[PDB]
Design a protein around this ligand. Sequence first.
Ligand SMILES: Nc1ncnc2c1ncn2[C@@H]1O[C@H](COP(=O)(O)OP(=O)(O)O)[C@@H](O)[C@H]1O
Ligand SMILES: Nc1ncnc2c1ncn2[C@@H]1O[C@H](COP(=O)(O)OP(=O)(O)O)[C@@H](O)[C@H]1O
Ligand SMILES: NCCCCCCCC(=O)O
Ligand SMILES: NCCCCCCCC(=O)O
Ligand SMILES: [Cl-]
Ligand SMILES: [Cl-]
Ligand SMILES: [Mg+2]
Ligand SMILES: [Mg+2]
Lengths: 223, 221
Amino acid sequence: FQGHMLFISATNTNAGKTTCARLLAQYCNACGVKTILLKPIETGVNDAINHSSDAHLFLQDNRLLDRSLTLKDISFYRYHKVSAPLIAQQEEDPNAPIDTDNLTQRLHNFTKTYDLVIVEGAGGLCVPITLEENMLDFALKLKAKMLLISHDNLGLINDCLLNDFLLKSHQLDYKIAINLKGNNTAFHSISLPYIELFNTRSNNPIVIFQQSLKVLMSFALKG
Amino acid sequence: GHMLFISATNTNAGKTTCARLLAQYCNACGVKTILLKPIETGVNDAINHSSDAHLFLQDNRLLDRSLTLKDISFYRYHKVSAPLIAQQEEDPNAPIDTDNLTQRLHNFTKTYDLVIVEGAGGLCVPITLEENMLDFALKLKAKMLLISHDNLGLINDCLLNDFLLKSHQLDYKIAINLKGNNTAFHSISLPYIELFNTRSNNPIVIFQQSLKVLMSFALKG
Ligand SMILES: Nc1ncnc2c1ncn2[C@@H]1O[C@H](COP(=O)(O)OP(=O)(O)O)[C@@H](O)[C@H]1O
Ligand SMILES: Nc1ncnc2c1ncn2[C@@H]1O[C@H](COP(=O)(O)OP(=O)(O)O)[C@@H](O)[C@H]1O
Ligand SMILES: NCCCCCCCC(=O)O
Ligand SMILES: NCCCCCCCC(=O)O
Ligand SMILES: [Cl-]
Ligand SMILES: [Cl-]
Ligand SMILES: [Mg+2]
Ligand SMILES: [Mg+2]
């Protein structure tokens, strides 16, 4: 068995990566698709004090599959500073640059025992991890598939398209999904019309996450 | 005259404020500078007189008192949305004409040293079925000043835009709109910018610190 890998990134931080990741994993696992959730690099955390980081939320979902799992098993580079990882690393752990080769082995390792390995990035695509590498670079090195989450507010069109432009310029499979809040009545009149229009002319349509679980599972497992 | 297009990482980033600050500086230095907002959305001119165009109008009147809103802003809609969406809903029979707009903007270069043009929202914001703000800026053969917010997340937003801009044949600069009370920026984001700048031939500057530099940029041949 060789399992599949889905990288999850976003238009920016605080866009819905974590929530959507969980929602997708939940769906997959319910359909009998054995799915683990990973947050390899995380910043803005203090694990002595609080247990509500993305890695912690992931850990508790993952433990429904493998109770022996621990935080250190699914998250590897963790910093207090609320910043890009590179900046956090340099300040808090100067002698230990983030090793993407290491990270890759570890993420791939999970594909040996899981049908689907979901990997949450940090912040957006151009967020720097090392002197030489950013999150997009990392996703490419992993040879993973890309799910890019967008916010659902005024300004999403610009953000989606900027990211579309960057992604389509690189050799990877990707989908862009909008994280639509249920109570967001404005979206369907304000943004959705351009998205519809954009989709008629694009071979890589932008979908609405909450309405695309089945479609996105398929995408994730395609090969 | 010279033409500077002003866009941003997104809407509500500081285009209007920075545009005014730059015009103010220019005009003070004897560089005759007009401020234009050709396309604007989310406005209701009967009720509210604080639109970007209105602010521009009152600045512009220090140079030419006869000027009126309709002279410096041409497509204006109530809907708080991308212009294309606003147009289709509010004025279906009148697509935005970028050829027209270009004439009208260029026209001002005849009588002004510098013509500053505020876009709407960001670069990929659609104006017509075929064209977005970046397209428009290219058609204008204008120079590009892209304003960025100063918050957590600016790196990503700056670089995304850098990527898109550097992929096209235009001169541009990216300026961070740094709030004066923003102590966090200097330790949270600035380090990466400095680092980025050491390795890029198109460094990211801090707007409030770069008025003279940006004026020069705007007037360079
Ligand atoms: N559909 C939704 N309804 C309510 N809150 C949401 C929804 N999607 C995301 N959020 C909230 O918005 C915030 C975004 O954080 P997160 O899911 O961690 O995004 P990111 O991983 O991109 O930082 C969280 O507090 C989360 O609970
Ligand atoms: N450097 C700054 N310092 C303090 N307030 C600012 C600064 N730049 C913009 N603002 C304020 O924040 C808001 C940003 O809006 P604006 O400048 O119109 O953004 P945009 O033109 O990109 O939509 C305005 O209300 C403005 O007064
Ligand atoms: N009031 C200013 C609104 C300008 C257009 C909004 C940007 C659309 C988007 O990128 O989703
Ligand atoms: N915990 C979220 C913080 C990590 C993302 C910071 C993004 C850096 C930037 O693009 O300026
Ligand atoms: Cl669950
Ligand atoms: Cl003034
Ligand atoms: Mg998260
Ligand atoms: Mg404005």
